[PDB]
């Protein structure tokens, strides 16, 4: 008769597996409304690890606390003004921290009470990966709506999702998440050395890359939030589950007792880096944004235009146009129609190659992703805590720092520009993003080699 208890903890785990999938998708939308540089979205994201460090039947209370955290995460939107077509993001930060609190006694006490009473971890993690695809599809459905929906006639909106300034309804994501957490809290109230470095220098890459994959697929390739969301949701997550299952299937398929698992970890890492260094050869050439990379006339890299030197237009505001030739100018003052110049069909076709390479990379990672815990008692806890703390808090911070080192035009808000980046010099974007990722991967690989040697 424990099956009801099992279903209760399953509904508990669904909320935790939904949380990150929600936050890292909301990060791109909550950067343009509060108009904050991309170095503080790192801190907002790291707040969720900050709370977990701070807090480091009863297993159910955390679910209601998380519902509270998510509802407080969305509460700023109701009690606030309108976003043009502040020191207020604090709530969001506080909110996220609250979330982390609930996350503390939920995951471990589950297995703890599970091993005492009466495979269970197996079936639980099997039914675990559901929430991610649910959340990815919800994000694909909500990244189609505005930010102040229910309060403005959508037809009077002029921005489009392919445009830069557009921001969706993230508060609804947090709201549905918190409501699900509250509901999942309802039943429990009635129910009764070198290896840590090796793994850190690999997990930091994954967390940063997930935090900024949408920034990449939106500024080098022409893919909005909805398409890239549902394409990872429908495709990449079932294959991730297939890899996680094949991990345990392989452990039984061949006896990888001690040297076998080491060889397998080296193998999965090498296959990862082998299928991950191909993003360079799928690279589409950068777009032409005059006045920021190339001068108004001629092709060379603030020497104002000869034609615009006479006109007394105003710098520092993004409202673009698309010349018939394929060059985008900053605003009609400086010079076809309102919008930008989308890339040729070449990049739109290359995006599917990007998708296939991403699927294959996540796959070849998922094989060792499960064997890692098999390889390594309190040391498990120390490794877990260290990777969580350092990766979570530090990855989006340094990633955002460098990505902010490559941002041509910014926005001004009454002072101190520090406005959300509204155009990226795409080649520098590729260099920085892929370079940090690849250098970190190889830094982990050399440690793998040293370990398997010893």
């Amino acid at each position, epitope marked *: 008769g424990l099956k009801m208890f099992l279903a209760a903890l399953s509904l508990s785990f669904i909320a935790k597996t939904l949380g990150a999938i929600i936050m890292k998708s909301s990060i791109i939308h909550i950067e343009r409304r509060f108009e904050i540089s991309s170095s503080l979205v790192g801190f907002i994201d790291g707040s969720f690890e900050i709370g977990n460090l701070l807090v480091i039947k009863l297993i159910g209370i955390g679910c209601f606390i998380m519902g509270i955290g998510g509802v407080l995460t969305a509460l700023p939107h109701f009690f606030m003004g309108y976003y043009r077509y502040s020191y207020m993001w604090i709530y969001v930060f506080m909110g996220n921290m609250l979330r982390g609190i609930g996350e503390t006694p939920i995951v471990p006490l589950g297995l703890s009470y599970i091993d005492d009473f009466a495979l269970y971890l197996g079936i639980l993690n099997a039914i675990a990966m559901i929430g991610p695809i649910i959340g990815f599809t919800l994000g694909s459905l909500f990244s189609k709506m505005y930010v102040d929906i*229910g*309060y403005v006639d959508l037809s009077t909106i002029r921005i489009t999702p392919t445009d830069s300034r557009w921001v969706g309804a993230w508060w609804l994501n947090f709201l549905v998440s918190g409501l699900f957490s509250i509901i999942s809290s309802i039943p429990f109230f009635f129910l009764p050395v070198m290896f840590v470095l090796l793994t850190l220098l690999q997990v930091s890459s994954y967390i940063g890359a997930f935090t900024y994959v949408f920034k990449y697929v939106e500024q080098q390739y022409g893919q909005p939030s909805s398409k890239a969301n549902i394409l990872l949701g429908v495709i990449t997550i079932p294959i991730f589950a297939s890899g996680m299952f094949l991990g345990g299937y392989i452990i039984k398929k061949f006896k990888l007792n001690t040297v076998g698992i080491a060889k397998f970890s080296c193998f999965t890492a090498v296959m990862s880096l082998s299928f991950y260094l191909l993003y360079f050869f799928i690279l589409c050439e950068n777009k032409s944004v005059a006045g920021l990379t190339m001068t108004y006339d001629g092709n060379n890299p603030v020497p104002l235009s000869y034609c615009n030197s006479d006109c007394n237009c105003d710098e520092s505001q993004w409202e673009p146009v698309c010349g018939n030739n394929g060059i985008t100018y900053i605003s009609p003052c400086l010079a076809a129609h309102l919008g930008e110049c989308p890339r040729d069909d070449a990049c739109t076709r290359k995006f599917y190659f990007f998708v296939a390479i991403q699927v294959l990379n996540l796959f070849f990672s998922a094989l060792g992703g499960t064997s890692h815990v098999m390889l390594i008692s309190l040391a498990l806890g120390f490794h877990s805590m260290v990777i969580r703390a350092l990766g979570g808090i530090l990855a989006p911070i340094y990633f955002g720092a460098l990505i902010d080192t490559t941002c041509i035009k910014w926005s001004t808000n009454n002072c101190g520009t520090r406005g959300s980046c509204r155009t990226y010099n795409s080649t520098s974007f590729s260099r920085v993003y892929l370079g940090l990722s690849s250098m970190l991967r190889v830094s982990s690989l050399v440690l793998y080699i040293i370990l398997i040697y010893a």
Partner: antibody
Amino acid sequence: VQLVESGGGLVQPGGSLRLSCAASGFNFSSSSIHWVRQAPGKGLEWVASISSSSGSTSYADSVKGRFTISADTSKNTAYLQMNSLRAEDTAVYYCARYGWGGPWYYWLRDSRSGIDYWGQGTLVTVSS
Amino acid sequence: SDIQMTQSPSSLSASVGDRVTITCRASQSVSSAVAWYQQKPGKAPKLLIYSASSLYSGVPSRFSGSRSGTDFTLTISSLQPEDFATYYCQQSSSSLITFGQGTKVEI
């Protein structure tokens, strides 16, 4: 965005007639088109309604029946076919849409009230 | 139903920058679904206020509508030269509409 009515003339007392209203810019299906009348130098009044693709015919307790309100959803048109306009129907008929109501978080307690967009209309006066 | 609406004033003589208080009365079945329109000669009416509190996006912020008991009211905060027209108070419920005889302001 724009709603234009066409048809209407000086039909002799008795007989029938039909007026059409075309509109594009909004989903022509999910927009409760309404007909409203204004006699020469007098107040306004309501005539009929087609809430959606569904008929949902509803009329006025003074000239009910003699009118029929239909719609060609494929041809994005609203039709009002009238019979035996005797003397009181002389007016300047107007098409209209129930505009997007106020903020849809707390205006579900109150029903739909506003009327956003209006056509210029043309007379359907009737006399001998 | 049998929803009616009456409009007591018929010719007002407010001056520039005043607080005219045009008031309609709900005869039967107060529905809290009123709407106030404005009409100039030989033109098509526009929406000033709907549900007696909110406004139409584009309308000057002077116009203030309010609900009290059974007699809704419309106060023009301060008149202007582009305001002297006819004002209509309409009531609507579940696909039945009723209108009013209109207040005509003048000087």
